[PDB]
Specification:
Elements lengths: L1 E3 L1 E3 L5 E3 L3 E4 L7 E10 L10 E7 L5 E5 L3 E3 L4 H4 L7 H12 L5 H10 L2
Antiparallel strand pairs: 1-5, 2-3, 4-5, 4-8, 5-6, 6-7
């Protein structure tokens, strides 16, 4: 594919390099990540319609490649995707991501602060 600086997700929102997203891989819940690159399939490719992003997971050492279909914008999907029960690394990642997002999506850190006990 060809790298680009942004694309539109399946829910119709723009995702750009540097943005915070929920990402999905097998064996883990939806997990917050930072977008490092975005790649779009091109007509000479084996699969011209494939599109993906390279992401860095919060609360984690790992970087992964996700189909755009396996990510979503962080704020808009937060209430849906945030697991209120999970502990440890997962909750630390949530905290980091909410803090990172607090200037464009202050509602998330707001919700997390209300939720904490």
């Amino acid at each position: 594919g060809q790298s680009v600086s942004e694309c539109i997700t399946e829910d119709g929102r723009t995702v750009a390099v540097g943005d915070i997203v929920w990402g999905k891989i097998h064996g883990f819940p939806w997990w917050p990540a930072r977008v490092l690159d975005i790649s779009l399939g091109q007509k000479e490719d084996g699969e011209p319609s494939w599109r993906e992003a390279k992401v860095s997971w919060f609360g984690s050492p790992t970087t992964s490649f996700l189909s755009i279909s396996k990510l979503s914008p962080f704020s808009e999907f937060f209430k849906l995707r945030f697991n209120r029960k999970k502990k440890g690394m997962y909750r630390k990642a949530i905290t980091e991501a909410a803090n990172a997002a607090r200037h464009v999506a202050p509602e998330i850190r707001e919700l997390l602060t209300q939720f904490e006990t």
